[PDB]
Design a protein around this motif. Structure first.
Motif, short mmCIF file in Angstrom:
data_model
loop_
_atom_site.label_atom_id
_atom_site.label_comp_id
_atom_site.label_asym_id
_atom_site.label_seq_id
_atom_site.Cartn_x
_atom_site.Cartn_y
_atom_site.Cartn_z
N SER A 137 5.55 -7.34 -2.72
CA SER A 137 4.30 -7.86 -3.19
C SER A 137 3.56 -6.50 -4.08
CB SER A 137 3.61 -8.72 -2.65
OG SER A 137 3.49 -7.88 -1.23
N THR A 138 1.86 -6.88 -4.06
CA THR A 138 0.75 -6.22 -3.84
C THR A 138 -0.48 -6.55 -3.26
OG1 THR A 138 1.91 -5.59 -6.59
CG2 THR A 138 -0.74 -5.16 -5.82
N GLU A 139 -0.68 -5.71 -2.53
CA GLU A 139 -1.85 -6.35 -1.65
C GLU A 139 -3.17 -6.13 -2.59
OE1 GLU A 139 -3.03 -3.25 2.53
OE2 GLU A 139 -3.17 -6.17 2.63
N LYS A 140 -4.25 -6.72 -2.57
CA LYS A 140 -5.99 -6.78 -3.05
C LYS A 140 -6.51 -6.12 -2.13
CE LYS A 140 -4.75 -11.08 -4.65
NZ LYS A 140 -5.13 -12.33 -3.96
N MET A 141 -6.91 -4.71 -1.81
CA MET A 141 -8.14 -4.23 -1.45
C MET A 141 -9.63 -4.13 -1.77
SD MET A 141 -6.86 -3.02 0.94
CE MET A 141 -6.18 -1.32 1.15
N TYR A 142 -10.05 -5.19 -0.90
CA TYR A 142 -11.69 -5.09 -1.36
C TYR A 142 -12.83 -4.69 -0.29
CZ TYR A 142 -10.53 -9.75 -0.36
OH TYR A 142 -10.04 -10.60 -0.16
N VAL A 143 -14.23 -4.78 0.28
CA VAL A 143 -14.76 -4.51 0.80
C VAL A 143 -15.58 -6.50 0.94
CG1 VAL A 143 -16.94 -3.86 1.82
CG2 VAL A 143 -15.50 -2.75 0.63
N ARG A 144 -15.63 -7.12 2.28
CA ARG A 144 -15.87 -7.92 3.29
C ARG A 144 -16.99 -7.88 4.34
NH1 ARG A 144 -13.45 -14.22 4.07
NH2 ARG A 144 -15.80 -15.21 3.71
N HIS A 185 -9.17 -1.62 -4.76
CA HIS A 185 -7.95 -1.18 -5.51
C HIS A 185 -6.08 -2.15 -5.30
CE1 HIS A 185 -8.16 0.76 -1.70
NE2 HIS A 185 -6.42 0.91 -1.31
N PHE A 186 -5.82 -1.57 -5.14
CA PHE A 186 -3.86 -2.34 -5.28
C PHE A 186 -3.13 -1.39 -4.08
CE2 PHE A 186 -5.23 -4.38 -9.71
CZ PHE A 186 -5.82 -5.23 -8.77
N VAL A 187 -2.44 -1.97 -3.41
CA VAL A 187 -0.92 -0.76 -2.75
C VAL A 187 0.23 -2.21 -3.14
CG1 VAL A 187 -0.11 -0.19 -0.84
CG2 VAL A 187 -2.87 -0.80 -1.03
N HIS A 208 7.82 1.63 2.34
CA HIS A 208 7.26 1.96 0.89
C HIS A 208 6.06 1.69 0.52
CE1 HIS A 208 7.63 3.86 -3.32
NE2 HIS A 208 7.38 5.50 -2.48
N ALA A 209 4.95 2.29 -0.21
CA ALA A 209 3.61 2.44 0.01
C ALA A 209 3.63 3.42 -1.04
CB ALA A 209 2.87 1.30 0.76
N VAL A 210 2.63 2.12 -2.89
CA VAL A 210 2.25 3.48 -3.50
C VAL A 210 0.16 2.61 -3.91
CG1 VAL A 210 2.38 4.03 -5.58
CG2 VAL A 210 3.73 4.13 -4.48
N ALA A 211 -0.05 3.22 -3.25
CA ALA A 211 -1.58 2.62 -4.31
C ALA A 211 -2.13 2.79 -5.35
CB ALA A 211 -2.91 3.53 -3.25
N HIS A 212 -2.61 2.53 -6.57
CA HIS A 212 -3.05 2.48 -7.76
C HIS A 212 -4.26 1.88 -8.08
CE1 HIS A 212 -1.36 -1.83 -8.68
NE2 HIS A 212 -0.55 -1.02 -7.78
N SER A 213 -4.68 1.22 -9.50
CA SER A 213 -6.21 0.83 -9.80
C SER A 213 -5.47 -0.21 -10.66
CB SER A 213 -6.60 2.66 -10.73
OG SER A 213 -7.29 3.26 -9.86
N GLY A 214 -4.46 -0.73 -10.39
CA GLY A 214 -3.62 -2.05 -11.36
C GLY A 214 -3.22 -1.05 -13.11
N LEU A 215 -3.30 0.52 -13.38
CA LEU A 215 -2.67 0.46 -14.62
C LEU A 215 -1.86 1.08 -14.49
CD1 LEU A 215 -6.38 1.33 -15.42
CD2 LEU A 215 -5.74 -0.69 -16.02
#
Length: 215
Positions: A137-144, A185-187, A208-215
């Motif tokens: 899956s993809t984790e959606k990362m934001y500030v709440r 961002h996304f992980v 295994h995990a990689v962070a990215h900006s969705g591009l």
């Protein structure tokens, strides 16, 4: 503060549907490559009367490949460390709460994991042990409200070509006031049981995990 090769030590104490257990872990990871692996042993409560797959995501986002253009909250939280709290909501009403306080002592991360599950149906795939694996899956990362939050909509593959859906929400808090929050961002991530014994009393786990900006 963080070395290319780091060790992992873990103790988890929890209860799922009133079943108490203690599970220890020992592992190694490459924080900059986004890879970790660990050997788990159930010390009390085994053989577990539920699917081991519901515990595996509770067994350190410091082991994610971050690109230069995303603030790495997790590497910048050390040496003091950080904590997370996580809720797991399953489609059949099953709910888990989990927390982890992560410290670093030399080349080793220590993890104090707590895990609490309830409201799993006795006839459901968790208490009948019909789960096969987590889907990538993809984790959606934001500030709440000033807190770094992450959401995951994913599923367990079951025997007989069926999925068992779960929503994750996680909050992350550095021990040090002053660690700046990243932008959204996304992980991307994958978690795999590499080997196990008969009742999953001994398990080898890989992530295994990689962070990215969705591009």
């Amino acid at each position: 503060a963080i070395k290319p090769d780091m060790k992992i030590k873990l103790r988890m104490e929890g209860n799922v549907n009133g079943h108490h257990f203690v599970i220890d872990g020992d592992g190694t990871g490459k924080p900059f490559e986004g890879k970790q692996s660990m050997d788990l042993e159930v010390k009390e409560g085994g053989p577990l009367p539920f699917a081991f797959d519901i515990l595996t995501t509770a067994f350190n986002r410091v082991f994610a490949k971050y690109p230069d253009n995303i603030q790495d909250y997790f590497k910048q939280s050390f040496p003091k460390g950080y904590s997370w709290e996580r809720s797991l909501t399953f489609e059949d009403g099953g709910i888990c709460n989990a927390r982890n306080d992560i410290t670093m002592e030399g080349d080793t991360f220590y993890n104090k994991v707590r895990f609490y599950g309830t409201n799993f149906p006795a006839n459901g795939p968790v208490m009948q042990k019909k789960t096969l694996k987590w889907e990538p899956s993809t984790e959606k990362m934001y500030v709440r409200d000033g807190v770094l939050t992450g959401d995951v909509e994913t599923a367990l593959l079951l025997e007989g070509n069926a999925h068992y859906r779960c929503d994750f929400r996680t909050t992350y808090k550095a021990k040090e006031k002053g660690v700046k929050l990243p932008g959204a961002h996304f992980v991307d991530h994958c978690i795999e049981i590499l080997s196990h014994d008969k009742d999953y009393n001994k398990v080898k786990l890989y992530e295994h995990a990689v962070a990215h900006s969705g591009l």
